[PDB]
Amino acid sequence: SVIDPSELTFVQEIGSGQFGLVHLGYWLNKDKVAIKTIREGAMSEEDFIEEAEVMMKLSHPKLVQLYGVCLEQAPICLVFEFMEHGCLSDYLRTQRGLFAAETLLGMCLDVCEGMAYLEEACVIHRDLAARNCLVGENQVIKVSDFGPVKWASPEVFSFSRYSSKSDVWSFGVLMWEVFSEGKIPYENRSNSEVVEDISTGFRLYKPRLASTHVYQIMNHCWKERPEDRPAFSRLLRQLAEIAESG
Ligand SMILES: N#Cc1cccc(Cn2cc(NC(=O)c3[nH]nc4ccccc34)cn2)c1
């Protein structure tokens, strides 16, 4: 669907990413929206439209939804549904010390449900992190930006070979982000240092709020070889097993 600039009311500025500015607005003085205006030079306008085109044909309750595309006036923008609490990364940083391990695991499950859908759809995310996840009504997590050495798997570090298994490693890191309440993976480590530690066999430490079982799954996502990593469909059942038990 096509949206006119006159149909949008820019209320306030709510974020600035590498690819553009995000605003809180209204469409047709009705629906509360998030307007993603393009950043010139950061990416081609064609790729900005294609990103949204792909997303509009992927329907899952745990993936962000668009209202449409506003192309008439530059800066060109994407009109998404509003996610009240914003990015998971920011929502974890503030609200830190208030989360329970039952809530945090439920967030991983929300993302895994979404990721298992994209996996079946043969769609590779390539940048799955807490910053690319959005918190909405009743703390539901939705995946966004489905059109970063700290989230990269060894195949990505040295050979740039992305797969659903590359996203599995990323999800393992996203899990650490979630159970660390927004903390940065490999805190004061350089890109060269992250590659060296992982290549030697080292991995992110067990976060305080995570159980031994949670870390067991994290380490299953962090297997050097991608064939020894579970698919998101297997991963989803693994997390649910601990969700109902203890
Ligand atoms: N009401 C309100 C309100 C006013 C100011 C800030 C906030 C918190 N906040 C919410 C967001 N939401 C988003 O950024 C957001 N929502 N859907 C999105 C889709 C794509 C990218 C970003 C999106 C960001 N900050 C909420």
φ and ψ at 225, to 5 degrees? -85, 135
CA distance 207 to 173: 11
Cβ atoms of residues 242 and 105 within 8 Å: yes
Interaxial angle between packed helices 101-120 and 232-244, expressed in degrees from 0 to 180 and rounded to the nearest 10: 160
Ligand 1: nearest atom to the Cα of 145: 20
Every domain range in the chain assigned CATH 1.10.510.10? 85-246
The verdict on the CB of residue 69 being under 6 Å from ligand 1 is no
Residue 127 annotated as catalytic: yes
Burial class of residue 104 (count of CB atoms within 10 Å of its CB; 0-12, 13-18, 19+)? buried
The verdict on the CB of residue 144 being under 6 Å from ligand 1 is yes
Name the class of domain 85-246. Answer: mainly alpha
CA nearest neighbour of 53 among 107, 120, 123, 110: 123
* CA–centroid distance, residue 26 to ligand 1 (Å): 12
Every domain range in the chain assigned CATH 3.30.200.20? 1-84
| Residue found under tokens 């992250």 | 194
The verdict on the CB of residue 64 being under 6 Å from ligand 1 is yes
Cβ atoms of residues 114 and 69 within 8 Å: no
Q: Count CB-CB contacts under 10 A for residue 114.
A: 26
Cβ atoms of residues 219 and 179 within 8 Å: no
Q: Which CATH number fits domain 1-84: 3.40.50.300, 3.40.630.30, 3.30.200.20, 3.40.50.880?
A: 3.30.200.20
Atom 11 of ligand 1, nearest CA residue = 86
Cβ atoms of residues 93 and 181 within 8 Å: yes
Burial 118-149 (b: 16+ CB within 10 A, else e): bbeeebbbbbbbbbbbbbeeebbbbbbbbbeb
Q: What 3-state class would DSSP assign to 111? A: helix
Q: What is the 3-state secondary structure (H, E, C) of the chain?
A: CECCHHHEEEEEEEEECCCEEEEEEEECCCEEEEEEEECECCECHHHHHHHHHHHCCCCCCCECCEEEEECCCCCCEEEEECCCCEEHHHHHHCCCCCCCHHHHHHHHHHHHHHHHHHHHCCCCCCCCCHHHEEECHHHCEEECCCCCHHHCCHHHHHHCCCCHHHHHHHHHHHHHHHHCCCCCCCCCCCHHHHHHHHHHCCCCCCCCCCCHHHHHHHHHHCCCCHHHCCCHHHHHHHHHHHHHCC
Cβ atoms of residues 151 and 198 within 8 Å: no
Cβ atoms of residues 34 and 85 within 8 Å: no
CA nearest neighbour of 221 among 238, 207, 240, 244: 238
